[PDB]
Structure 1
Amino acid sequence: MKHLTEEQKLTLDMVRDVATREIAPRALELDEKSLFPEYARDLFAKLGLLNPLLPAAYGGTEMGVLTLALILEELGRVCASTALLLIAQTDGMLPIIHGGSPELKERYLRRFAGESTLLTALAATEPAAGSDLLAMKTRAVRQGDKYVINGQKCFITNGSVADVIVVYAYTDPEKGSKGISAFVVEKGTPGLVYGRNESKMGMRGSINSELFFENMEVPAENIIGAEGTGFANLMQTLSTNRVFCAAQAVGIAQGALDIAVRHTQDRVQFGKPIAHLAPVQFMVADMATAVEASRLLTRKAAELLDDGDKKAVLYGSMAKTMASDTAMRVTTDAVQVLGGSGYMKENGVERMMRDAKLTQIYTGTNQITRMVTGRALLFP
Structure 2
Amino acid sequence: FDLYRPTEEHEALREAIRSVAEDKIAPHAADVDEQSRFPQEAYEALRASDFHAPHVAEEYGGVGADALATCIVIEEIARVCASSSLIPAVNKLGSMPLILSGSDEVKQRYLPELASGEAMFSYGLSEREAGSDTASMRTRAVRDGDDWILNGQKSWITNAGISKYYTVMAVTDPDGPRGRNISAFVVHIDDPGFSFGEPERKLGIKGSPTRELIFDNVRIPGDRLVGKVGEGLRTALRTLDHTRVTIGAQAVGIAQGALDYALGYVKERKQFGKAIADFQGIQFMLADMAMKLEAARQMVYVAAAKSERDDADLSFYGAAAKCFASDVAMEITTDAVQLLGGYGYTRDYPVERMMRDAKITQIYEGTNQIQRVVMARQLLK
**After TM superposition, is the score higher than 0.5?**
yes
1:185 paired residue number:
187
The equivalent residue for 1:142 is 143
Q: Is the 8 A contact 2:28 2:41 kept in 1?
A: no
User: Does 2:127 correspond to 1:126?
Assistant: yes
The answer to whether the aligner puts 1:172 opposite 2:165 as a matched pair is no
| AA partner of residue 129 (structure 2) | A
- State the distance in 2 between where 1:7 and 1:62 align: 13
Q: CA deviation at 1:268?
A: 0.8
Match for residue 330 of structure 1?
332
> Aligned partners of 2:285 and 2:14: how far apart in 1?
30
Residue aligning to 2:14: 12
Within-5 A mapping of 1:1-380: 4-5=6-7, 7-114=9-116, 116-174=117-175, 175-379=177-381
CA distance in structure 2 between the aligned counterparts of 1:18 and 1:357, rounded to whole angstroms: 25
Q: Which whole-Å deviations, capped at 9, do the CAs of 1:144-171 have from their partners, x for residues lacking one?
A: 1001110001100012221111010000
Write the distance in 2 (CA, Å) between the matches of 1:61 and 1:259. Answer: 32
Paired with 1:348 and 1:68, the residues of 2 have a C-alpha distance of 25
Distance in 2 of aligned mates of 1:79 and 1:266: 24
Alignment partners' CA distance in 2, 1:200 and 1:113: 30
Per-residue deviation, 1:4: 4.4
Question: Paired residues, what number?
Answer: 378
Distance 1:319 1:146 in 2: 41
| Whole-angstrom CA distance in 2 between matches of 1:2 and 1:272 | 39
Amino acid of the residue matched to residue 369 of structure 1? Answer: Q
Partner-residue secondary structure (3-state), 1:60: coil
Tell me, in whole angstroms, the C-alpha distance in 2 between the residues paired with 1:60 and 1:181: 26
Q: Is the contact made by 2:143 and 2:149 (CA closer than 8 Å) also made in structure 1?
A: yes
What residue identity is the alignment partner of 2:347?
K
Return the offset for 1:7: 4.4
1:317 and 1:89 map into 2 onto residues whose CA distance is: 20
* 1:6 Cα offset (Å): 5.1
Instruction: Identify if the C-alpha distance between structure 1 residues 117 and 39 changes in structure 2 by more than 3 Å, giving closer, same or farther.
Output: farther
Inter-CA distance 226–326: structure 2 relative to 1 (3 Å threshold): same
Q: Does the CA contact (< 8 Å) of 1:2 and 1:303 recur in 2?
A: no
CA deviations 1:194-247 (Å, max 9, x no partner) are: 111111000011110111111101111111111100011000111111001000
Q: State whether residues 20 and 46 of structure 2, in contact with CA within 8 Å, keep that contact through their aligned partners in structure 1.
A: no
1:113 & 1:71 partners in 2: Cα distance? 15
Structure 1 CA distance, aligned partners of 2:82 and 2:103? 34
Q: Write the distance in 1 (CA, Å) between the matches of 2:181 and 2:50.
A: 37
Question: d(CA) in 1 for partners of 2:44 and 2:28?
Answer: 14
Residue type matched to 1:225 in 2? G
SS in 2 for 1:196: coil
Distance in 2 separating the partners of 1:291 and 1:4: 17
Instruction: Check conservation: 2:346, 2:352, Cα contact below 8 A.
Output: yes
Q: Which letter does structure 2 place at the counterpart of 1:309?
A: D
Cα deviations across residues 236-259 of structure 1 (Å, max 9, x unaligned)? 111111001000000111111111
Structure 2 gaps, min length 5: none
Shift of 1:5: 4.8
Letter of the aligned partner of 2:256 in structure 1?
Answer: Q
In structure 2, distance between residues paired with 1:161 and 1:272? 49
Q: Aligned AA for 2:165?
A: V
> For 1:188 and 1:333, how far apart are their aligned partners in 2?
45
Partner AA of 1:99 in structure 2: S
Which whole-Å CA distance do the structure 1 matches of 2:364 and 2:304 have between them?
18
Aligned residues with identical type, % of pairs: 44
Q: Distance in 2 between matches of 1:6 and 1:257?
A: 25
Over residues 104-163 of structure 1, what are the superposed CA-to-partner deviations in whole Å (9 max), with x where a residue is unaligned? 11122232233x231110000000110011111100011110011100011000122211
- Give yes or no for contact 1:45–1:117 (8 Å, CA) kept in 2: no
What TM-score do the two structures reach when normalised by structure 2? 0.97
In the alignment, the residues of structure 1 paired with residue 20 and residue 137 of structure 2 have an alpha-carbon distance, to the nearest angstrom, of 40
CA distance in 2, matches of 1:109, 1:73: 23
TM-score between both structures, scaled by the size of structure 1: 0.97
CA contact (8 A) 2:126 2:156 kept: yes
Alpha-carbon separation, structure 2, partners of 1:13 and 1:331: 24
Aligned AA for 1:173?
P
CA RMSD of aligned residues (A): 1.2
What's the secondary structure of 1:184's corresponding residue? Answer: strand
